[PDB]
């Protein structure tokens, strides 16, 4: 009987679930866990885990929506869900990750926390004939679960357990996710406006079905600059640029752009002015004052004209024969490379190129999971094929025929992948008018999703909803790669300003951040403010350039 107790916990295994097909597998009491070097202390709590809507898909495979929920004995009254990543399919510890490379989890701050696998299981839904762990795309309902339904079901189940376990409903609910988790957050704001009061959506894949389009585009754009072929005769896209070549490119970007914010410090805060000024075909190598593009043959100090032509085309984004942009363009930024000690940053090049030191293609968008996901999860009908065919399929991508498939329905696939996965709506009025607050962030050197495309969504949001900065703000991060890493201030506590905005009405005029790898700048630490779009961080003119107190958020100089 007694609330928030070990007995209340075990009783959850007369509990009425919102979905009748909810099956509790574990309801176990957990002692407090001390802090570790990489994780804050976890309070005493009830762990509930189980699944919703066990079934068999039309592919003969089993499917269910897994969840894991943790409810602390000492509870602050708030509910918290963390978002997913990749193509989901895994169930985390569900202590409420807040991203930003943070030590603390939401459970360590006495939230009740929940996580899902998105409706499929990478250990079970791994089909060798359907490109491995993306195979859930062969089941229409599993697609719908991945797009929106799993997070809806798990939110309802979690809130129901909270109300039963504590004798009262959550005062406020919070959702934080990055990447695929960021798409989920935007989706919740659009499709389920009252599920969460506060949403953090980092590097959000809100047009994820278009990623494979960009992937085929960057693959074909980079092929003229590749050197060699892989085991099935596909150009080695990873050989198009060495790490030294990419570092040369970012040094050229810094040469053109670093000081456009007023401070030569290795960070391009004035990203708009950089885009307008930088052209690798006209820019100079600052180390030697010569043109970045070779006049003669290839040296370590220049880039071949084919290299320059290739990267420019990849960064421009895909079009069809009519010239219509199919996704968006990408921003030149220093975080495309980076050097800390003797280690080159791999956090940008792994997406479109892959590791240089390999005899095979391994880029996410050439032969990796992104290309695989587009083929089976997002094309309708799905296009399963052997793993060794994926790279060739990207080289033969037809930008007039293939991009239509993310909008198509076929057979039992009664929704398009943009229908169930896309989160492009700017109608956040219901969300805003019940008190919802949303923090978006995106690293400028993200090669998975374009930071400029997030910016264009924010522009459209501001136009559809005048005064949108009162409930939704965007924080771009110079130098940061996808969700983390790179030469920028990629670490931040987003949960604290989110709670302040939701509950005290305090909008974040800036968000403190620090660099996880300050070696990129040759310093022991760098702290900087993140600034709400379209402001940027501006140095005050005096003081240590690595200290956040010497910076302020303002317009570009
Ligand atoms: Ca700068
Ligand atoms: Cl993290
Ligand atoms: Cl100082």
Author numbering: 43 to 55, 60 to 603
Article, verbatim:
Recently, the bacterial strain Ideonella sakaiensis 201-F6 was discovered and shown to grow on low-crystallinity PET films. Two α/β-hydrolase fold enzymes (α/β-hydrolases), PETase and MHETase, work together to degrade PET in two steps via MHET, yielding TPA and ethylene glycol—the building blocks required for a new round of PET synthesis. We have determined crystal structures of recombinantly expressed and purified I. sakaiensis MHETase in its ligand-free form (2.05 Å resolution), MHETase bound to a nonhydrolyzable mono-(2-hydroxyethyl) terephthalamide (MHETA, 2.1 Å resolution) or to benzoic acid (BA, 2.2 Å resolution) as well as ligand-free PETase (2.0 Å resolution) (2a−f). PETase and MHETase only share the α/β-hydrolase fold (2.87 Å RMSD for 184 out of 262 residues aligned).
Apart from the entire substrate, even substrate sub-structures and analogs such as benzoic acid or nicotinic acid are able to bind tightly to MHETase as observed in the respective co-structure and in differential scanning fluorimetry (DSF) measurements. It is again mainly lid domain residues, which establish the contacts to benzoic acid and place it in an identical position as MHETA. Thus, substrate recognition strongly relies on the aromatic ring as well as the carboxylate function of MHET both guiding its positioning for hydrolysis. Inhibitor experiments with benzoate derivatives and R411 and S416 mutants also demonstrate the importance of the interaction between the carboxylate moiety of the ligand and R411 together with hydrogen bonding for tight binding. Consequently, the loss of the positive charge in the MHETase R411Q and R411A variants leads to strongly reduced substrate binding and decreased inhibition by benzoate in mono-4-nitrophenyl terephthalate (MpNPT) hydrolysis. The high affinity for compounds with a benzoate substructure is expected to lead to product inhibition by formed TPA when higher concentrations of MHET are hydrolyzed in vitro. This is demonstrated by the decreasing reaction rate for MHET hydrolysis over time. The effect of product inhibition is likely less pronounced in the natural environment where formed TPA is metabolized by the bacterium.
